Structures are given as C-alpha cells and as structure tokens.
Amino acid sequence: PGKKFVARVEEILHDPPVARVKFEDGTKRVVIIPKGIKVGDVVEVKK
Amino acid sequence: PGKKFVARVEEILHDPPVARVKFEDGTKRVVIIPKGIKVGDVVEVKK
C-alpha cells in the first residue's frame, strides 16, 4: 500500500501541475498533484 | 500511474526550462521541469 505521511502545500507550479510541500518535519518535496489542489492544503503522500 | 522515484536538482538550464537531477542511486537525468523549480530541490519523477 504505502506509508502514512502528511505534508503542507506551499507553492503550486502549474505550466502547460506540481506542488512544493513541507512535510511534518520541515522537509520540502515537490510532488505531482492532480489539478484541484490549492496552497495551504494538507495532503497525504508516501514514498 | 507511474513508479515512485526521487531525484535531486543540481543545475537548471533555462534558455528562452530543463534540470539536471541526480536520482537516489547517483544516476543523472536531465528532465523537463516547470518554471518555479530551484537547485537543491527534491522532486518526484518517473519513467
């Protein structure tokens, strides 16, 4: 299935979308999110 | 969907953008990234 991780969306980089998200421990990852996500959202993400 | 891969951005080559990224295992790939990415970021990339 995957592991349990929560991150917060800071900046969305849409350019015809990806998101820079901060995890629980200050880590920053830029992940692929579907169109509909906004900044400030909390998302569940794995490895 | 795609597989799970993490890479680190080393150099951005913007010239009117692409990025040289190192994966988990020292591999280097130059991928297409949207405008907003910076060097040192960790990005999720597939095949």
Side-chain angles (χ1 to χ4, degrees):
Chain A
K3 331 311 156 290
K4 301 203 190 132
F5 279 101
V6 185
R8 185 182 295 276
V9 178
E10 304 208 85
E11 182 144 58
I12 292 201
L13 299 146
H14 210 174
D15 212 53
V18 259
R20 200 173 287 92
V21 312
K22 268 195 139 188
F23 272 104
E24 288 233 53
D25 44 56
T27 181
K28 260 170 217 152
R29 221 126 136 166
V30 173
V31 314
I32 158 189
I33 58 176
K35 100 160 96 196
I37 306 284
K38 318 150 170 182
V39 202
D41 289 348
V42 174
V43 296
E44 277 200 354
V45 180
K46 16 204 24 230
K47 154 175 142 147
Chain B
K3 331 311 156 290
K4 301 203 190 132
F5 279 101
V6 185
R8 185 182 295 276
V9 178
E10 304 208 85
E11 182 144 58
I12 292 201
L13 299 146
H14 210 174
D15 212 53
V18 259
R20 200 173 287 92
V21 312
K22 268 195 139 188
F23 272 104
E24 288 233 53
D25 44 56
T27 181
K28 260 170 217 152
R29 221 126 136 166
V30 173
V31 314
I32 158 189
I33 58 176
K35 100 160 96 196
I37 306 284
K38 318 150 170 182
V39 202
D41 289 348
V42 174
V43 296
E44 277 200 354
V45 180
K46 16 204 24 230
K47 154 175 142 147

